[PDB]
A paper describes a structure:
Its structure features a central immunoglobulin (Ig)-like β-sandwich that contributes to the binding site for the cellular receptor CD81. We generated and characterized anti-E2 MAb DAO5, which specifically recognizes a linear epitope comprising part of the CD81 binding loop and the E strand of the central β-sandwich within HCV E2. We show that a synthetic peptide corresponding to a β-strand of this Ig-like domain forms an α-helix in complex with the anti-E2 antibody DAO5, demonstrating an inside-out flip of hydrophobic residues and a secondary structure change in the composite CD81 binding site.
We expressed a Fab and a single-chain Fv (scFv) fragment of MAb DAO5 in Drosophila melanogaster S2 cells. Three independent structures were determined by using the molecular replacement method with the previously determined crystal structure of the unliganded scFv fragments as the search model (scFv-J4 peptide, scFv-JFH1 peptide, and Fab-J4 peptide). The distance spanned by residues 532 to 540 is considerably shorter in the peptide structure than in cE2 (20.6 Å and 11.6 Å, respectively). In the presence of nAb AR3C, the side chains of F537 and L539 are oriented toward the hydrophobic core of the β-sandwich (red side chains in Fig. 2E), whereas both residues are buried to more than 80% in the DAO5 binding interface, indicating that they need to be solvent exposed to allow interaction with DAO5.
Numbering used by the authors:
A (entry chain H): 1 to 133, 140 to 220
B (entry chain A): 532 to 540
C (entry chain L): 0 to 213
């Protein structure tokens, strides 16, 4: 089976250079052009450029001229994209794709994506704050000041799964904030305890925060 | 058809 | 000029079993050189149709494409639960290769005003010298919404962190979290903390507030 395997998530500093890889298996690497695509918030897809592995011919989107450089390593059937002078604008998920299949070709096989986060941050555990205040009551947990992603949240160790909203984390001033809400009947709180469990594997953190009335 | 030379041939 | 692909409407709301058509319009004639992709979360784009109408091995028969020149259409002949997500068109007739901005295929439901809850800073955060005020704007539909923070009746935009959920897998609604962060010193210089939610469900914003000194 045709497989495009990309290198792992990257946590890089502003101004750095980074090279990310797209390693193929199951077919002849030099058969088809490779393409790189940037997935940014929206979601939004942008085409960066293409390289013809058989001869090194390229075509670039002018928007990425200088920023991104394409290459191939035929000895290892691996396509590479190199970024220079990284900024927060370059934080995105990058995909490689081949332009093959039955004739006429199209972007038929894709890599799994490579997440790139450009930040000056160091691994930092989260602070977990309680969110305490109808027929229903909403409680929550505010997860701030941590790095990197991911942080995962459960309520009562997964026993409270209905009426939960866990929001995507957002990076602001080189630290993340995440929040999670839970809605329970007003009659059940504070009599039935509500606790968020916050896991941050990067910092070896797993903490509980019980929500109590103000 | 400026892309065929690169993408299809 | 780069070929501009316009996908309009940006959001199509349907129910499983409906027949749907998605539009991709080109700024200049591109013959049959349009391809369609499905895209979910941060996963790889998936090729559905190539060269406006050509089928792809393994793609279910319910997906078809038609059109030529500048007017293209992707059709789903009876929408299945697995089909909700983003649909992007792409042109390969001219350099640079370009994508449309995408159409979100979402689950249709009845409009719902957000359930708004506001929370003062926790004593734990205050002890650390910080003050975050959180508003959850939960289970609303449709997705567009605006939040404004007012401190002592004055709009505040500094220190606001917003996050939005994808469409809820259980009830087809959307949620939003908004966190306003101040220092403890700045938080104590004011009394009223308000978050105003503007949504299509009412001509009046939902106004949730608290007074610090209460």
């Amino acid at each position: 089976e045709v497989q495009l395997q990309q290198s792992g998530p990257e946590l890089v500093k502003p101004g750095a250079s980074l090279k990310i890889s797209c390693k193929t298996s199951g077919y002849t690497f030099t058969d088809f052009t490779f393409h790189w695509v940037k997935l940014s918030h929206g979601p939004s897809l942008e085409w960066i450029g293409t390289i013809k592995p058989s001869n090194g011919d390229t075509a670039y989107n002018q928007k990425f001229k200088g920023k991104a450089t394409l290459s191939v390593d035929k000895s290892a059937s691996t396509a590479h994209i190199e970024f220079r002078s990284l900024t927060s604008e370059d934080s995105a998920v990058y995909f490689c794709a081949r332009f093959g299949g039955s004739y006429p070709y199209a972007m038929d096989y894709w890599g799994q994506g490579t997440s790139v986060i450009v930040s000056s941050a160091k691994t930092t555990p989260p602070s977990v704050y309680p969110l305490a205040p109808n027929s229903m009551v909403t409680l929550g947990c505010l997860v701030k000041g941590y790095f990197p992603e991911p942080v995962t949240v459960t309520w009562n160790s997964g026993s409270l799964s209905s009426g939960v909203h866990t929001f995507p984390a957002v990076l602001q001033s080189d630290l993340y904030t995440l929040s999670s809400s839970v809605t329970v009947p007003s009659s059940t709180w504070p009599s039935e305890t509500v606790t968020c469990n916050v896991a941050h594997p990067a910092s070896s953190t797993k903490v509980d925060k019980k929500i109590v009335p103000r | 058809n400026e892309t065929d030379v690169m993408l299809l041939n | 000029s780069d070929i501009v692909l316009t996908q309009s409407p940006a959001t199509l709301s349907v129910t499983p079993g409906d027949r749907v058509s998605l539009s991709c319009r080109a700024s200049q004639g591109i013959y049959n050189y349009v391809h369609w992709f499905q895209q979910k979360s941060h996963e790889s784009p998936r090729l559905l149709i190539k060269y406006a109408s050509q089928s792809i091995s393994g793609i279910p028969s319910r997906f078809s494409g038609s059109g030529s020149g500048t007017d293209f259409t992707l059709s789903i002949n009876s929408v299945e639960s697995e089909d909700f997500g983003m649909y992007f068109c792409q042109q390969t007739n001219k350099w640079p290769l370009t994508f449309g901005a995408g159409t979100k295929l979402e689950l249709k439901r009845a409009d719902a005003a957000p359930t708004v809850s506001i929370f003062p800073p926790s004593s734990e955060q205050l002890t650390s010298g910080g003050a975050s005020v959180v508003c959850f704007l939960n289970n609303f539909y449709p997705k567009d919404i605006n939040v404004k923070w007012k401190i002592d009746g004055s709009e505040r935009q500094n220190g606001v962190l917003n996050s939005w959920t994808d469409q809820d897998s259980k009830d087809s609604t959307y949620s939003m979290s908004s966190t306003l962060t101040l220092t403890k010193d700045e938080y104590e210089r004011h009394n009223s903390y308000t978050c105003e939610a503007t949504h299509k469900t009412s001509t009046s914003p939902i106004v949730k507030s608290f007074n610090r000194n209460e």
